[PDB]
Design a protein around this ligand. Structure first.
Ligand SMILES: C[C@H](CCC(=O)O)[C@H]1CC[C@H]2[C@@H]3CC[C@@H]4C[C@H](O)CC[C@]4(C)[C@H]3C[C@H](O)[C@]12C
Ligand SMILES: CCCCCCCCCO[C@@H]1O[C@H](CO)[C@@H](O)[C@H](O)[C@H]1O
Ligand SMILES: CCCCCCCC
Ligand SMILES: CCCCCCCC
Ligand SMILES: CCCCCCCC
Ligand SMILES: CCCCCC
Ligand SMILES: [Pr+3]
Ligand SMILES: [Pr+3]
Length: 386
């Protein structure tokens, strides 16, 4: 019974470290290919861009042909594309395979989590949702620490063998444990019908504002994940110790913000938690921007600002995700996929803008772009909350 949700969580973990272990490893990757450091954050951009490729299709598709075969195909695709990147002959082919690997991210929410809601009761589903949320918080903390430790002893190729191996364990467990729970098995799938749905959700102004706001507000965190290898190691000329150590207060604060959210949710509305989290979000981004404009190498102030920011994200984002879902009356699969794709668009484009910001203006410009993104979230929250 519970072997199904556990293997889905193991698969979730494997795809999350698929990003988070690789980013510190990208310094070794670009050294092996003799590619520029500008390809380091583009690894994450490709991986994210893959995750918005089939996200629209898979929910409606798996409802018609079965949750089992579609989920198993996504796990097998992840394994094959993880092993396939070892044969990449240049950084362009490497980046292409990061994109193909990224398609595997679509299957977690659209196919896997849909089957969890259909299978289990409301009480058990909430416990599984919380476990998946905890794995999402642990991955970006341990990922860079483990990735940095991995690369000093073992080659980058081994990391993809690890992700494939962890995904292969979840495949066999999902093969045995996952029940078929698709409701519309046998019915026809119309692409024009899907077109009509996704055009209709985008007409909702509050839904779009909330989804866009989630993308803008989390972009500084994702930009840090993408670039912190090249910012700290290449830019500031520091070791993996400093790199790994500076992840702790940032992602520890993100966890702390979520722990505070858990203790406050019974006596706070989602509106108040957005306003309460908004103070650390804006103050954190201001401190990081102002310090690095005053002095480009003020990386401890940057880390302090990002940690205060991350605390507010942990407090505010889950509530905004809920309000954005309530803003649209259309089906949960369409609503989840649409707001997921809107965030991914902002993350992919944002990380590339962030890359060019840092390459042209150093830490100051990196943090100033992140501040603008915080202001765009804040602007949207003024409209979104009347
Ligand atoms: C926002 C979607 C959710 C899609 C959905 O289920 O509808 C999720 C799916 C996969 C998620 C990414 C997986 C890899 C990374 C893991 C880190 O721990 C945080 C940053 C990244 C880059 C994640 C950011 C974001 O949280 C994504 C893109
Ligand atoms: C999915 C989680 C995978 C965890 C695997 C991480 C292995 C990292 C090994 O690091 C190495 O450990 C040695 C001590 O054992 C040190 O001597 C060495 O300096 C260090 O580089
Ligand atoms: C029987 C499996 C069909 C393929 C499902 C995967 C869709 C991308
Ligand atoms: C607002 C904080 C400014 C700190 C400047 C640091 C100078 C090295
Ligand atoms: C060596 C400079 C110390 C800066 C400390 C800033 C912490 C908020
Ligand atoms: C969001 C793009 C969907 C297109 C379906 C034809
Ligand atoms: Pr219709
Ligand atoms: Pr429909």
């Amino acid at each position: 019974a519970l072997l199904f949700p556990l293997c889905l969580v193991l698969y979730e973990f494997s795809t999350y470290i698929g990003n988070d272990m690789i980013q510190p490893g990208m310094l070794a990757v670009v050294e092996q290919y003799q590619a520029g450091i500008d390809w380091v954050p583009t690894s994450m951009t490709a991986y994210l861009a893959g995750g918005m490729f089939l996200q629209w299709l898979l929910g409606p598709l798996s409802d018609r042909i079965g949750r089992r075969p579609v989920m198993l195909a996504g796990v097998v695709w992840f394994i094959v594309t993880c092993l396939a990147i070892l044969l990449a002959q240049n950084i362009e082919q490497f980046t292409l395979l990061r994109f193909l690997q990224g398609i595997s991210l679509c299957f977690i929410g659209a196919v896997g989590y849909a089957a969890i809601r259909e299978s289990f009761e409301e009480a058990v589903c909430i416990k599984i949702t919380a476990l998946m949320a905890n794995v999402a918080l642990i991955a970006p903390l341990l990922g860079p620490l483990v990735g940095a430790a991995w690369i000093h002893v073992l080659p980058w190729e081994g990391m993809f063998v690890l992700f494939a191996a962890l995904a292969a364990i979840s495949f066999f467990g999902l093969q045995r444990a996952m029940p078929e729970t698709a409701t519309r098995i046998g019915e026809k799938l119309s692409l024009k019908e899907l077109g009509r749905d996704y055009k209709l959700v985008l007409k909702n102004g509050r839904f779009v504002a909330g989804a866009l706001a989630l993308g803008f507000v989390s972009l500084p965190l994702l930009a840090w994940i993408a670039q912190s290898p090249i910012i700290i190691i290449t830019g500031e000329q520091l070791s993996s110790y400093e790199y790994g150590l500076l992840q702790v207060p940032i992602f520890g604060a993100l966890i702390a913000g979520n722990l505070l959210l858990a203790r406050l949710t019974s006596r706070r509305t989602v509106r108040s938690l957005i306003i309460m989290g908004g103070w650390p979000i804006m103050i954190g981004l201001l401190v990081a921007a102002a310090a690095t404009v005053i002095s480009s190498h003020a990386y401890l102030w940057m880390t302090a600002g990002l940690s205060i920011y991350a605390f507010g994200i942990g407090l505010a984002n889950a509530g905004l995700v809920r309000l954005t879902e309530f803003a649209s009356d259309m089906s949960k699969g369409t609503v989840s996929a649409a707001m997921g794709m809107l965030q991914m668009l902002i993350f992919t484009v944002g990380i590339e803008i962030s890359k060019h910001a840092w390459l042209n203006g150093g830490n100051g410009l990196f943090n100033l772009f992140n501040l603008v993104n915080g202001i765009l979230w804040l602007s949207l929250m003024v409209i979104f909350l009347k």
